[PDB]
Amino acid sequence: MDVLSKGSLKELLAHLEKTPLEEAISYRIGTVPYQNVLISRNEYYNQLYPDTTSLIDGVSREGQRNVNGLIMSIISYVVSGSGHYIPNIGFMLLRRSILDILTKHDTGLVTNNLNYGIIARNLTVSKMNCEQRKRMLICFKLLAYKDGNQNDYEIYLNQNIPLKQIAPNFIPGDMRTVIHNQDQLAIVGIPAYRLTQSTELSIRDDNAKSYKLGYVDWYNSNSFLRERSEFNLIRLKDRDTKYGKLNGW
Amino acid sequence: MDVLSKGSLKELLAHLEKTPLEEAISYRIGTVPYQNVLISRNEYYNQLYPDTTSLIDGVSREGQRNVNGLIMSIISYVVSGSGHYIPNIGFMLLRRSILDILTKHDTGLVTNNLNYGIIARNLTVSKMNCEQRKRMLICFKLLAYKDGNQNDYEIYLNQNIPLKQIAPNFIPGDMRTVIHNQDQLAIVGIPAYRLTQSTELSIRDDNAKSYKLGYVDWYNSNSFLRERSEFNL
Amino acid sequence: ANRATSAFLDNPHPVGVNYVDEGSRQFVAVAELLASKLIDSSRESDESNSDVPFVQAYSKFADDNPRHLRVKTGGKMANALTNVIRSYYSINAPAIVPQVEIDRLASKATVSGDMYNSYAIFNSVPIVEVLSPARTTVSIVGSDRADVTMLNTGAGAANITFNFGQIAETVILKGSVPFQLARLNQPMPAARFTYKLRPLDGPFIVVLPVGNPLVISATAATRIQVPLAFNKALVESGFQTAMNDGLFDIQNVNYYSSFDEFIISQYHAQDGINRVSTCVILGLALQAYDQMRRALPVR
Amino acid sequence: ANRATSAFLDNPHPVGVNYVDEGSRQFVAVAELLASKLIDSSRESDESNSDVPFVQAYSKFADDNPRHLRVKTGGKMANALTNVIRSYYSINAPAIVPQVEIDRLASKATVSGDMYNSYAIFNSVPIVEVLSPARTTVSIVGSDRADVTMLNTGAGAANITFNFGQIAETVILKGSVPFQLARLNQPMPAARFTYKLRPLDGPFIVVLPVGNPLVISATAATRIQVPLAFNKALVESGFQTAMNDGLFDIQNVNYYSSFDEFIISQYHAQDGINRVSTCVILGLALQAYDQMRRALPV
Amino acid sequence: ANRATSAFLDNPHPVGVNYVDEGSRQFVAVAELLASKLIDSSRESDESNSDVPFVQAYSKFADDNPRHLRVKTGGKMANALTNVIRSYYSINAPAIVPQVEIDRLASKATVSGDMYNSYAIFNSVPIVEVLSPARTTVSIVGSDRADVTMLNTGAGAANITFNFGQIAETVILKGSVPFQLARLNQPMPAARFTYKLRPLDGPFIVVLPVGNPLVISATAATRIQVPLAFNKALVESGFQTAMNDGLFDIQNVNYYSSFDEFIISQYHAQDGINRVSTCVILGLALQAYDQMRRALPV
Amino acid sequence: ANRATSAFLDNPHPVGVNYVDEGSRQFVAVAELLASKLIDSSRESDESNSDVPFVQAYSKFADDNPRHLRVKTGGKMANALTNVIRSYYSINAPAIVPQVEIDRLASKATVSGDMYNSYAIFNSVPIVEVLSPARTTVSIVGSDRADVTMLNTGAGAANITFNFGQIAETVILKGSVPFQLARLNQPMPAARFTYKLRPLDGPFIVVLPVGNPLVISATAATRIQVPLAFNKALVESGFQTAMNDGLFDIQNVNYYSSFDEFIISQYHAQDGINRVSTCVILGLALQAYDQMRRALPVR
Amino acid sequence: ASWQLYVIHPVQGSLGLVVQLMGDALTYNVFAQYGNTSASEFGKTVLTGGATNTALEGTKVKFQTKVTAQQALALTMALKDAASMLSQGELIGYFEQYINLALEPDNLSLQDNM
Amino acid sequence: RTVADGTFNSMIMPRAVIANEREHFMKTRIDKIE
């Protein structure tokens, strides 16, 4: 919910710096990812409604124990709000931030063998919307810069024409590029249209609307932080600053 | 609607005195009765609703040209509110009052051969409520006493025990019996407020419900519209 | 000799003879007018997220206020309209709506129940009979466009008689190959692709040469008097809706693909002029039915 | 044994899964509402002999006043409407329109993007399979009216099995000559011209006598839930406009003569109830495309 | 060939056609509501050591104060409730209650009288027909749980046809030993203990191997629309009470073990959907009869 | 030897392993409590002739105000409850309800997620196996009351071994005729009509004399821990409703006639102590489902 | 509703008669007994007196005529004129008696017209 | 079709051949002759 609310590149990377890896990993068993299932949608149909479960749903799924599953759990958390079930990763890796895993070699995780095409296909890039594809491409660029695979990232964009048009423009080592970026990455937000307490047909759409309706409740909740009215009560370390720089950028 | 509103024997007899036989006969061609049909009741069921047509429905039906048909048309008007299609009866007979047909010999009609059991079966007495049955028995007693068939009416009541319990307590030709009668014969009255604008499953129940709901509107507006045509006659 | 006829013209079942008086015609016109208000109010209610426009229209239509516990089906007005529709379709369907209810529902709105203000055009092509010699095969297929496939195997050319009903105004014939057609006891013209015919002139004769088959495509236009509110698009939709809901499931009745086939078939039967008037009233009733069901949906 | 099937029911391509939420549904509804006013503004312009009704309608639709220099295109709404139409047709088409742009355009007018208010009747005739024995020829042709021509050259009468699926509600069969039809394990009635059938009843057997060919004409009626603003005449015109304008030219997609054929083909595919909702939204989008492009040709 | 049918499905007698209108439906609902308050007031009187709560409840129900030297019978409401129960069962019942009396009793409380606000599940299993070939014996026992015992004496395996009607929603079949069952014109599956069936899916064929008898236990569930105040436990008690009191003792009627069998049997009769509405009102009246008679025994 | 077993005990399919934590248990209890308010409000609306009590309770249940022309189904709460029910039944059923939705709905009302406050009695009779000699026939029918029919065709008396499992508390055996039953390696007692048995005592031997068949009727009672809000009548009604609506139609699952059969079958399978916990939550969920649909019906 | 249809095939004759009575409306058609194809039992109509529907469905009673086709036609023509002034029982009773018993109608005026 | 009277329907009604003396006399005579 909090990760889906971020609407700018600066906010997204700032959230990932303060968020540990354990938030990406889920400890609920879930179900196997790719299955043709029948779900109940009584608002629309009397018969059961066919659908296919996927990894970018908002509900936890079972994940492979390899490094591929860990990266695929991080991206699903960013684009869908929930991760997958990969237990016994370890204290050392789980305490690191999401940005450290994606960008830093000191974590101890080796990810240079990853194939962006296979990861995108397993994440069902075809079913993703524009904001979801932009968020995943941000994760790919950070991984490419960590492994020195910038050339491979560019070629993968050349093969996929729709991905090249929406590819965010920022150098993963320079903070000046992040501040200038004006891409809108928000998935949930205050809706200008009429939003009703109604169900959706597919699993992805229904789960997304739950976060959208939950965010509205979160926005008016006491947990939400109102910068306009309570800026002085925020701690100085985590207070918003114009000259905000990620470490090493 | 006027005939169904009467709730006492003396009101009902008074209405029949002023009502010509024309009002008890319909000019609409209608449909043949005793037919198994499927009707649409979408308030309750998606499928068609089985039912059977009858003479005592509120809708006009084709009638026979015999005397039996004319008596059945009179009774149907009393119990259901509508008559039957019997064409070319005659101007002189149609001008006579309903009570004249039932209780007077000057009309020129012969009703001695009528079988009360057959007439009741043709009118589906098994499907009639208590108020409808009492109205039908009033018409039988009037016809029986005109023909000198008082004994036959009593014997017919002995055979049908349930009809004997609700038999009207009046002797035709005696004014004292009519004055002191305490029967309730109102099929249609000012509705209890609990009544709603909803359909009923059966043909008979829905048509009776239609008369009940439209009685309030008819009560307020019938006098002026009747007078607008009655004057300068 | 062989005889071929259109499938939809065969044995038109008798139509109802009830609810055709002036008062009943007013009831159908009022139902169409009030159903149009109902379908418009539902659009306004959806746009404004308010039930005020729909409650006002439903109360006018059904004489009752919508309730959450109950089910909105149209009320007594809906019950009468559906049952009168069945009565029009067949004489076997009963008449179960009392005249008091018909008079009450006709007073809701003030309209003139005139079913002859305007005209409408129907495109069903009537082929009453096609007569062919022994050695020829003739097949008739279609109602909106009739394709007549004819093949001659005999030694000599065959004369084939085409009889179109006297009702239709204009018939246009187009062949896959040029052919000769002429009226009875009239000279044969040169072979041409297209003929325009008036069926009232008389039976037509087509000369079939031996060899490749000839296919004739027929289209027709007939004008039938209808009320001004008549809408063929809405009437056709209501006809299919009534069939799917089982309103026309009556014993010993014939079934048709469209209202155009129904009205043309009943016109071509004996006492067709009397039958068409009832069908037109049924067309307006079906128009009211379609708008009412779309406004009040049942899954 | 030979098997014959309808040509338009073969291999329905997967439809898109984007732009089918509440926010996008109201965008299509707003476009349909505002495109209707664009057409109606032309009639109002004639009455007043002024272009100010059209300017008002165009400004609301395009967020900019029309200019005599350039051709009227419709602005951002037209670009968004064109792209969502492409995405609906095929899964391979990109979803390039951002959510924020859909968010802003859906706020122009007040509507509810509910696509299950009403119903529409679609007339495509589904014939999944016609099973015929040897020495018989069966040809199925047509979608709105399916003509099945059957000829048997064998010694005796043959039995032909007809399978109309399970989705269609009513199928009417009319023969050139009277024929016999009955369900599986049922007695065969007298020859009759017209049969009314329900596809859920089961497979149907037709006696094919030896001799002249027998042709059966089939008409079908299917009810699909659609929004109240649905107009089949405008949806069908929009389908032809989009096909001619090259909005459906994507790799590995199937093409159909009408929206009637398109919606029924996806309905009869495996897990076809998922595709029906998306195709309905595409129909409303095509209704807006037809009105917008007729007012502003390009 | 032999035919076996359930005992309770045979010859449903005609039901009454009186006291089924809106005014009479409210009276039955009024009686149920006031009868429930009689039971509750008696419990309150016992706990509070005061007869004041019972006096109010009896006065409302019976229009008269309780008296020590007069038998507590429930007044005119009890007589009217008893008489309508007799009328509902058979068309030959007298049906002598006046309309003025029914209307005045429906004014004692305000209730809708709607008999379609809810639903109830009925467990009676309807085996309309079991068709068995020669050299096989089939016996059907029970209504709530139907046990079908089949013996194959002949040389080879026999096919047995099961017909469950078109009204029941679902039917579960369980066997003593694994058995094969399939629909008409369908391949037989591997033998298994339990089958779940939809009765509308045609007759079912059971393969009966030669040897030890095979016993099939059948359970079915049917949903019938009932008012919200419907309570199956109280309806069942009232049905047994009414039979013992002689309310159902009329000429030319059929008797059933439970109200479950009564309602299902009338449903399966020709044009049985007419009777099901009257049977529900009878069930509600029996629910009022049970509570009233338990509070005021006679 | 021949082996016979109860039909409902055979092959219990695995139950779901999702939505069994404290947060999900609170959501089911909240749904049951709110569904009970929904059914009582509808009764109050009938008695008061006002829709205010029902609209008041529907808003809490569905988080939305009822609007005319829109079908009342229960809102997002109904969607979560129906899909969670499917997951409890089978492990093949998908888990599609997000954790954010479960937490939000669980906060609507204050209630405990405790599922072990009270107990209930279940009457399914577990007959794990009946072992018989060669010349005898044994048939077992019924679940609530199990009738075992035994016929001996051999020369002498035969011994039939009865295994009732280890879970059931008491088993009462009634015979059509007096019969002898004793434990393993125990002298046979005099013939008696009835026997009260403890299933933990061990396998039981029945002497079957040569002659007329002997029928033994078995009744069993077992104790399972359930929440205080558990109502057996409501749970059973919901189980049949869920079956009719098709929520239990999943691949490779077993179907039971009653919830009593379902819970006993899962208890007797391996790791049945863990399975029975999930079944209890399903029973409470079915109780909420039964009350929700009876308040909001569909024709 | 009472309707009745009579099909008379005289063995001693060359013509047949079809008589239909729907209520009090009597119609007849004289048909040839020769030239019939196997499809229909009636030849071409030689004399017409209205429209007769032979496809009516109901119980069929077989009888043998005791009068010639000319005698049956003579009574049918007379019965048509007196259809309005006679009851249905009289219309039937006179026709059945003449066809089946060769019994002349008791009504003297009707007898003269025949 | 005009309205139907009851004249035809009374003719085809069954008769009491035993109770009626004239009907019994006639069938005894025919049985004797045969």
Author numbering:
A (entry chain P): 1 to 249
B (entry chain Q): 1 to 233
C (entry chain H), F (entry chain J): 2 to 300
D (entry chain F), E (entry chain K): 2 to 299
G (entry chain W): 287 to 400
H (entry chain U): 25 to 58
Sentences from the paper on this structure:
Here, we report atomic cryo-EM structures of three states of BAV virions—surrounded by 120 spikes (full virions), 60 spikes (partial virions), or no spikes (cores). In the full and partial BAV virions, genomic dsRNA segments and a number of RNA-dependent RNA polymerases (RdRps, VP1) are packaged in a double-layered icosahedral capsid consisting of three proteins (VP2, VP8, and VP10). The spikes protruding from the outer capsid shell are heterohexamers composed of a VP4 trimer capped by a VP9 trimer.
Visual inspection and 2D class averaging of purified BAV YN15-126-01 virions on cryo-EM micrographs revealed two types of virions: one surrounded by more spikes on the viral surface (hereafter referred to as full particles), and the other with sparser spiky density (partial particles). In the full BAV virions, there are 60 spikes sitting on VP10A and VP10B, respectively, while in the partial virions, there are only 60 spikes on VP10A. Local reconstructions focused on the fivefold vertices produced a clear map at 2.6 Å resolution for tracing most residues of VP2, VP4, VP8, and VP10 in the icosahedral asymmetrical unit (ASU). VP4 trimers are situated in the cavity formed by six VP8 trimers and directly interact with VP10A or VP10B. The C3 symmetry is broken for the three N-terminal tails (various numbers of residues were traced) within one VP4 trimer, which are involved in forming the asymmetric interface between the VP4 trimer and VP10 monomer. Despite the symmetry mismatch between the VP4 trimer and VP10 monomer, the interface is similar for VP10A and VP10B. The VP4 trimer has an overall negatively charged patch near its C3 axis at the VP4–VP10 interface, while positively charged residues R65 and R121 are present on the VP10 side. At physiological pH, VP4 (pI = 5.9, negatively charged) would electrostatically interact with the basic VP10 protein (pI = 9.0), suggesting that electrostatic interactions between the VP4 trimer and VP10 may play an important role in association of spikes on the virus surface. Binding of VP4 trimers also results in a total ~1800 Å2 of buried surface area on VP8 molecules surrounding VP10A, which is ~10% more than for VP8 surrounding VP10B ( ~ 1600 Å2), likely contributing to different affinity of VP4 trimers for the outer capsid shell in the full BAV particles.
